[PDB]
Amino acid sequence: DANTFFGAESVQDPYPLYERMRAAGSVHRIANSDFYAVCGWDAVNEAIGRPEDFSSNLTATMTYTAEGTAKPFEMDPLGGPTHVLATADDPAHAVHRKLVLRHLAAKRIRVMEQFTVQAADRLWVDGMQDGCIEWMGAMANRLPMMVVAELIGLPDPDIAQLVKWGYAATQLLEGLVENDQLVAAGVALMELSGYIFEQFDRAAADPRDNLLGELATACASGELDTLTAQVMMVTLFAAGGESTAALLGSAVWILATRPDIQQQVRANPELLGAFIEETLRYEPPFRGHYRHVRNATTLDGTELPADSHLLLLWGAANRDPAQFEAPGEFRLDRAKGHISFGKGAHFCVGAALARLEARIVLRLLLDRTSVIEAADVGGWLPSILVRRIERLELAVQ
Ligand code: HEM
């Protein structure tokens, strides 16, 4: 594959790849695999609007052999009970989404704001020494994991552990990182799982006003199964922790490497919300999400066999030249949006929270500095699904 989704180049910068795929059409088979890249804006919107045809159950991911050949990493079949929340179809999906939304209501977000302000300040104090901070390990990796742990109700977490735990599932699900990294991720996910099961067993005996308690209560009344509830909580670390970490990393990487953009936001602090939205458009934390194709059908004109899969490429949709002027240019004056939080039945429940974490953290960084520059920029996580920088050493004044 001239158009492979893995390899050093695609990991570093996948956007030219998406434009090549788009030449073949808005939907296009990946090599000779059973996966079809969805790069068109209208095609992604159509797909997400057809949950009956394109299930969210994660029945397979795309992986690559050592020989570089795409192949399916098969998981739980269509309709299975392992599919929860973001990967569940209705009716279970709507129950799951309702329960989690209770912990993301307006009042909940206000509490989170106070929590985030205090946590961000402590992280900055600990991490910024002699005009230097490694942004990923000190801030971007930690803060969003602490927020997910607080939403769930975990007591006074070991932050070092949380980061490991929170990044484990992506690595395991793709099987793209090296074997030693995969073994460590498996240990990490075992540890995370076991910790959640321990905390849930304790919540069931005395439910408190957090998602653990909400779930313990809903299980007691028969609304869902105990194991389903525990798995739901496990998945929130990748869903809400890793994704937000990625945004915090990319936003800063852009500030640090585009002085013109950084001066614009400094000079006109009212452009911070636009800058966050443009980062979401231009470097979405998720490269994509899968769907399972239930029956032979068509999407935006393109044929799809039964039991194939879609890869919904949010980043590629956000650069569709039918929808956006100057799609490849980072601009602070746009007034269409983006599809980086999805749309429709599974539209991100955490979007307000994510946007709040970005606003708090980025305003702290900008308010406390006069100039930020990149001293050393690491590589990106080897992934087909997630767009996360691994290391970003800043020099500040
Ligand atoms: C920048 C940060 C974030 C991005 C880019 C992001 C993106 C997404 C996307 C694209 C979807 C739809 C997936 C699909 O259609 O298959 C989604 C769903 C979801 N997001 Fe996020 N998200 C972020 C932050 C968060 C946070 C902070 C939380 C929770 C604390 C969260 C929880 C979820 C959940 C539970 C769903 C599934 C909703 C449902 O199935 O009804 N997200 N998110």
Residue numbers in the entry: 37 to 371, 374 to 435
Reproduce passages from the article.
The N-terminal truncated version construct of CYP144A1 (CYP144A1-TRV) was generated using the previously prepared full-length version CYP144A1-FLV/pET15b plasmid vector, and by deletion of the region encoding the first 30 amino acids. Consistent with this conclusion, it was found that the CYP144A1-TRV form crystallized readily, allowing the determination of a high resolution (1.55 Å) X-ray structure of the ligand-free CYP144A1-TRV enzyme. The CYP144A1-TRV crystal structure contains two monomers in the asymmetric unit. However, a dimeric solution state is unlikely, since solution state MALLS experiments indicated that both the FLV and TRV forms of CYP144A1 are soluble, monomeric proteins (as are the majority of bacterial P450s). Both monomers in the crystal asymmetric unit have a similar overall conformation, with an rmsd of 0.55 Å for 393 C alpha atoms. The structural elements (F/G-helices and BC-loop region) important in determining active site access and substrate specificity are those that are most distinct in CYP144-TRV from other P450 structures. The relatively long linker region connecting the B-and C-helices folds into an extended beta-hairpin, that occupies the region between the N-terminal beta-sheet and the FG-loop. This creates a large access channel to the heme cavity, approximately 10 Å deep from the protein surface and 10 Å wide. The active site of CYP144A1-TRV is predominantly hydrophobic, with Phe321 and His324 side chains located in close proximity of the heme 6th ligand. These residues are likely to be important in determining substrate selectivity.
P450 monooxygenase enzymes are hemoproteins that typically catalyse the activation of molecular oxygen and the insertion of an atom of oxygen into a substrate bound close to the heme iron. The Mtb gene Rv1777 (CYP144A1) from the pathogenic strain H37Rv (which encodes the cytochrome P450 enzyme CYP144A1) is located in a region of the Mtb genome rich in genes encoding proteins of unknown function. The apparent exclusive conservation of CYP144 P450 family enzymes in the mycobacteria suggests the retention of an important catalytic role. In addition, the CYP144A1 deletion strain was markedly more susceptible to growth inhibition by azole drugs than the wild-type Mtb22. These data point to important function(s) for CYP144A1 in Mtb, and possibly to its participation in the Mtb stress response mechanisms.
